[PDB]
Paper text:
During the mycobacterial DNA damage response, the heterodimeric transcriptional regulator PafBC activates most of the genes required for an adequate response to DNA stress. Based on sequence similarity, PafBC belongs to a family of bacterial regulators featuring a winged helix-turn-helix (HTH) domain at the N-terminus, followed by a C-terminal domain of unknown function named WYL domain after a consecutive W-Y-L sequence motif. PafBC activates its target genes via a promoter motif called RecA-NDp (RecA-independent promoter), which was demonstrated by in vivo identification of PafBC binding sites using cell culture cross-linking followed by immunoprecipitation of PafBC-DNA complexes. Mycobacteria and many other actinobacteria employ two distinct yet interconnected pathways in order to upregulate the expression of specific sets of genes required for repair and survival of DNA damage.
In this study, we determine the crystal structure of PafBC from Arthrobacter aurescens in its non-activated, DNA-free state. Three-dimensional crystals suitable for data collection were ultimately obtained using an A. aurescens PafBC construct (AauPafBCΔNC), which was shortened by 17 amino acids at the N-terminus and 7 amino acids at the C-terminus based on sequence alignment, since these residues are not conserved amongst the orthologs and not even present in most of them. AauPafBCΔNC crystallized in space group P212121 with two molecules in the asymmetric unit, and the structure was refined to 2.2 Å with an Rwork/Rfree of 20%/24%. The PafBC structure features six distinct domains, three in each of the homologous PafB and PafC modules. The structure reveals that the WYL domain exhibits an Sm-fold, commonly encountered in RNA-binding proteins, and is followed by an additional C-terminal extension (WCX) domain featuring a ferredoxin-like fold. The HTH domain of PafB (HTH-B) is accessible in the structure, since only helix H1 and a small part of H3 make hydrophobic contacts to the rest of the molecule. Importantly, the putative recognition helix (H3) appears wedged into the protein core, and following H3, a long loop extends around the back of the central α-helix of PafB (α4) and the WYL-B domain. The PafBC WYL domains are located at the periphery of the molecule on opposite sides, while the WCX domains come together to form a dimeric interaction module. We obtained the crystal structure of PafBC in the absence of DNA, in a largely asymmetric domain arrangement that is likely characteristic for the non-activated state.
Residue numbers in the entry: 1 to 65, 74 to 121, 132 to 448, 453 to 664
The structure:
C-alpha cells in the first residue's frame, strides 16, 4: 500500500536520474530491496510497476542488445516538466499551493535578519469574500441585486439591476452571469469591474429560468486581449514580477531601477498586484493601468485620513465568529469535496453539507478557501473552469483534453511540499487511486531528484547543532514525556521558558519543526528546531491536553510565536479579509464595515497588505505600524505627482 506508493516514487526517480539506463539487477537493489523473494516475484512486481507508471503518464524506455536490458525515463534529462492534470488533480494541487505559500511566509519572516516577498510567493489576488457572499446570499434567498459596474466600453460607471444566475471562473477570473433587468437580457459581469459592494435587495424576489446553463454561458466568454505594461522597478526587488518580464533594461534616469515590460490581460488584476509593491514600482504605461494603481494607493491614503472609530469590541458571545484557523479535519474534508466537484452532477451544497454534518454556510466557507482564494504563484491560470449556481458547484470536465502544464524544478518542489503535508493527514477508514496520489507522482517527475527532500515531511537531514534537540524531542514523544523548552525569540537576544507536550517532529523546505502542546499558550504551537535554546524533561508525563478541548489548527495554521497583533478597520467591500486572516475579534460598524484584530506573521508584510487592498483596509493600532504603513503609501504616491 504505502510501500507501493513509495516504491513507485523511488522507481520513477531512479529511472529519471540515469542518462545511460539502469539494468534490472541494479533496479532490484536500489528500489526493490524490500522484496525478500527472488527474481520470480520481483520480476512481475517490476512489470506491474512499469505498467502502473505508464498510466501516470511516464513511458519507461527499454534499451537493449531479457536481463540484458537497461531502462530509463526522460531520455537524457532527469526531469519531466510537462504533466497533464485532470480537474481533480488540479484542484488538489490548488490546496497544496496554498499550504506551500504559508510555509514559505513563515520561513521568510523567521529567517530575516525594506519588505520583499520571498521566492515563489506573489500577492494573492482573489475575488472579494463579501461580494461572493452577497451573490451567494442573493441566489439562496432569490433576491435580485444592484451594483456599480464600469461599462464594457470602459465608459460611464453605471448601476446595474441584476437577477443573479451564477458565478463562474474562466482564465482564473470570476464572473457573475444573470438577467440584467435594465437590458432585459442576460449579461456577464467581471467581478473585478464592479465599483461597489453588492447590495442584495432583500425586499424583492425572482426565479431563475429553468433552462439556464451556466457552463455554456461562460464557455461562450472570449479571453481578454493580452496587453503590454511598462514598469520601472527597484533593482533586486519584486522577484515574482521579474519572472513575468518580457524585456529588461536599465531605467532612463533613476539610478538603481530597471525598466521592464510585462504582459497582462485585466488591468484591475495587475493594478492590485502592483499597488501591493508600493514604492518599489512605478507604472509608466498604459494610462488605464497607471490610473488604477494610483486610485488604490490614493484610496488607501484617504482611508487613513478618515477619523478613527472607537475601538469597542463586543463580548464576542452575541457575534458571528470569523473563519477559524484551518484544522486537519477541514483539510481532509476539502480533499473529499473534490470528487463531488468534478462528478458530472457536481456538488449540491445542502445535501453535501448534511452528509458531512456541517452547516450550509460552513460548507460554503470550505469551498471559498479551496477554490475562491485565487491561484498562488507557480499554479497555472488556465487549469480550472468553475461554475457556482444556487446550491450547486461544479468544476467542468473538458473531456479528453487534459490541460498540459509546465513546472520548473522550483515550482514542482514547492508544490510537492504542500502535497506531502496533505499526504500526511490522518488516514481514514475506507488506500490507492486517489487524485492526491496521482498528482504527487506526476509532480515528482517534474521536480526530479529534488522531489526526494521536498516530497517528504520526515527524511531531511539534521544539522549538527540541532541533533541534540532532535533526539530529545524524539525520545520524549516516544516515551510520553513532557519537556521544559527554552525557545529563542526572533532576534535570539531572549528566550521564553515553557512546559510543552511534544507531539510531532516534521520537516518542510529543509527545516525541522516540532508540534507541541504549549502549557504557556494553553494551545498547540509549532516551533522551529533551530530556535530551541534547550530542551529538558521535567519529570512529568505528557498532559494530553492536545486531545482535550475543541479542534486545533493544522500545523501550518497555528498562531506563530513571532506574530504581531494589529487592529484593522475594514470596509464592507473588504469585510472578507477578517476571515482570510482568522481575526481574533471583530466589531461590526454602521455601514457594514468592521473592526478586526488580527495576527500578522511579520510586521513587514503589513504595508504591502494595506496598499494592495487600496482603501478597504486601514491600520488603527499600534500607532507605530500605522504611520510606517502611511509612509509606504505616501512614498508610493509621490512617484506619480509630477
Ligand atoms: K533520464
Amino acid at each position: 500500500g504505502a510501500s507501493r506508493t513509495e516504491r513507485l516514487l523511488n522507481l520513477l526517480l531512479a529511472l529519471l536520474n540515469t542518462k545511460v539506463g539502469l539494468p534490472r539487477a541494479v533496479l532490484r537493489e536500489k528500489v526493490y530491496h524490500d522484496s525478500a523473494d527472488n527474481d520470480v516475484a520481483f520480476g512481475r512486481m517490476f512489470e506491474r510497476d512499469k505498467v502502473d507508471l505508464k498510466q501516470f503518464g511516464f513511458e519507461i524506455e527499454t534499451l537493449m542488445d531479457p536481463a540484458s536490458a537497461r531502462y530509463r525515463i526522460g531520455k537524457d534529462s532527469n526531469r519531466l516538466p510537462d504533466v497533464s492534470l485532470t480537474p481533480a488533480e488540479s484542484t488538489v494541487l490548488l490546496l497544496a499551493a496554498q499550504l506551500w505559500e504559508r510555509a514559505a511566509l513563515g520561513s521568510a519572516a523567521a529567517n530575516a535578519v525594506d519588505v520583499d516577498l520571498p521566492a515563489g510567493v506573489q500577492p494573492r489576488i482573489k475575488p472579494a469574500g463579501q461580494a461572493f457572499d452577497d451573490v451567494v446570499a442573493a441566489m439562496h434567498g432569490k433576491h435580485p441585486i444592484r451594483f456599480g459596474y464600469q461599462a464594457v466600453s470602459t465608459g460611464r460607471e453605471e448601476v446595474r439591476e441584476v437577477e443573479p444566475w451564477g458565478l463562474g471562473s474562466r482564465f482564473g477570473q470570476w464572473y457573475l452571469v444573470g438577467l440584467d433587468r435594465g437590458r432585459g437580457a442576460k449579461r456577464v459581469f467581471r467581478l473585478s469591474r464592479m465599483t461597489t459592494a453588492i447590495s442584495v435587495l432583500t425586499t424583492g424576489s425572482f426565479h431563475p429560468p429553468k433552462d439556464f446553463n451556466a457552463r455554456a454561458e461562460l464557455d461562450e466568454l472570449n479571453e481578454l486581449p493580452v496587453r503590454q505594461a511598462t514598469l520601472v522597478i527597484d533593482k533586486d526587488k519584486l522577484l515574482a514580477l521579474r519572472k513575468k518580464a518580457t524585456s529588461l533594461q536599465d531605467a532612463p534616469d533613476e539610478s538603481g531601477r530597471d525598466r521592464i515590460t510585462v504582459d497582462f490581460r485585466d488591468p484591475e488584476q495587475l493594478a492590485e498586484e502592483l499597488a501591493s509593491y508600493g514604492p518599489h514600482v512605478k507604472v509608466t504605461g498604459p494610462a488605464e493601468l497607471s490610473a488604477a494603481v494610483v486610485r488604490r494607493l490614493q484610496a488607501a491614503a484617504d482611508f487613513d485620513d478618515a477619523p478613527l472609530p472607537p475601538l469597542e469590541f463586543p463580548e464576542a458571545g452575541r457575534a458571528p465568529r470569523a473563519r477559524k484557523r484551518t484544522s486537519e479535519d477541514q483539510l481532509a474534508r476539502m480533499l473529499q469535496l473534490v470528487p463531488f466537484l468534478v462528478h458530472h452532477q457536481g456538488l449540491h451544497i445542502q445535501e453535501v453539507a448534511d452528509h458531512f454534518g456541517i452547516s450550509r454556510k460552513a460548507l460554503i466557507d470550505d469551498l471559498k478557501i479551496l477554490i475562491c482564494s485565487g491561484l498562488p504563484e507557480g499554479y497555472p491560470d488556465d487549469l480550472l473552469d468553475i461554475q457556482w449556481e444556487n446550491d450547486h458547484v461544479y468544476i467542468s470536465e473538458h473531456l479528453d483534453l487534459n490541460r498540459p502544464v509546465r513546472f520548473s524544478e522550483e515550482e514542482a518542489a514547492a508544490l510537492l511540499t504542500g502535497l506531502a503535508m496533505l499526504g500526511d493527514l490522518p488516514a481514514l477508514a475506507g488506500g490507492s487511486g486517489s487524485a492526491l496520489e496521482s498528482v504527487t507522482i506526476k509532480l515528482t517527475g517534474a521536480a526530479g531528484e529534488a522531489a526526494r527532500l521536498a516530497g517528504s515531511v520526515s527524511g531531511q537531514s539534521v544539522a549538527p547543532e540541532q541533533a541534540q534537540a532532535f533526539a530529545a524531542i524524539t525520545q520524549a514523544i516516544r516515551e510520553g514525556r513532557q519537556l521544559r523548552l527554552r525557545y529563542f525569540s526572533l532576534q535570539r537576544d531572549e528566550v521564553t521558558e515553557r512546559d510543552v507536550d511534544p507531539l510531532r517532529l516534521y520537516s518542510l523546505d529543509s527545516t525541522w519543526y516540532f508540534e507541541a502542546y504549549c502549557h504557556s499558550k494553553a494551545g498547540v504551537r509549532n516551533f522551529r528546531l533551530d530556535r530551541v535554546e534547550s530542551l529538558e524533561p521535567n519529570g512529568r508525563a505528557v498532559s494530553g491536553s492536545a486531545t482535550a478541548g475543541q479542534d486545533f489548527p493544522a500545523r501550518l495554521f497555528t498562531p506563530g510565536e513571532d506574530d504581531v497583533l494589529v487592529c484593522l478597520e475594514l470596509t464592507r467591500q473588504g469585510a472578507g479579509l477578517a476571515d482570510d486572516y482568522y481575526a481574533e475579534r471583530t466589531a461590526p460598524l454602521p455601514d457594514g464595515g468592521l473592526l478586526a484584530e488580527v495576527r500578522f506573521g511579520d510586521a513587514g508584510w503589513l504595508p504591502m497588505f494595506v496598499s494592495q487592498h487600496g482603501g478597504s483596509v486601514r491600520i488603527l493600532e499600534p500607532e507605530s505600524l500605522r504611520q510606517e504603513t502611511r509612509a509606504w503609501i505616501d512614498a508610493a504616491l509621490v512617484q506619480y505627482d509630477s
